[PDB]
Amino acid sequence: AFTFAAFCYMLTLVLCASLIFFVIWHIIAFDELRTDFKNPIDQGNPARARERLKNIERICCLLRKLVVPEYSIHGLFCLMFLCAAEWVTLGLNIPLLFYHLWRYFHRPADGSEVMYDAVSIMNADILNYCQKESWCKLAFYLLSFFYYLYSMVYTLVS
Template sequence: MGFTFAAFSYVFALILDAFLIFFAVFHVIAFDELKTDFKNPIDQCNTLNPLVLPEYIIHITFNVLFLFAGEWFTVLINIPLIAYHVYRYIHRPAGMSGPGLYDPTTIMNADQMSRATREGWFKLAYYLLSFFYYLYGMISSLIAV
């Protein structure tokens, strides 16, 4: 029984997607803490900003593996989120000197906070659905061998 590159890609994606689920849950909890004044905006940005680039890199990494494995449908369903990540990072607040998306001076605006909360919930749902799809893809690629 062999282990194909596609099966390896799905196993790797499952492991990394678990980290992305953790990041999304942390994102949702962090903005809930900010909304209830449990944390101040500076601390919040200092904890969220270092996680932005690792999330993006993890997501792009296993999609490159899917690209090399020829899993075109999987790449196709991930392209919209990758495009959103690129758009979001290009259009981050102008005064940001380091990596990240969140600026302490604007994060408390109601529209910014609601958008970030919706974004966190959307990513959580997306990564959870992706997890089960990758599980299905792993099992089907292992059975096909």
């Protein structure tokens, strides 16, 4: 009983795998950043002082790059389920799409233009908030992946 919606589910599962990997790399980067920031050895050390700045710049640039693929791919999921005539899953996915739009466009805190500028991204509140958000996002992506698998099998067998 192959159907357009079933293929959408298969493709969405394939891409949710990569989304999961992106979020995992994000949480790993933030764990490393937190461990380094809590470590003041780089602070107040004439040697390797530039090392901390270089690491911060590297991480901020890398996660500045990793963000657009995730957001655009989730938007692709939303569009696909819109055209698939799937209403439950699209409703479940729109809130996170709006969250991503808000994150990318709001520009709060009167800070720098970029999301991770490595200058205002050193506030402990920022790290805590984003680590919690990333963990919640990972949990949601796992749940969505399993839901996609279950829906795919259910639609296909039907």
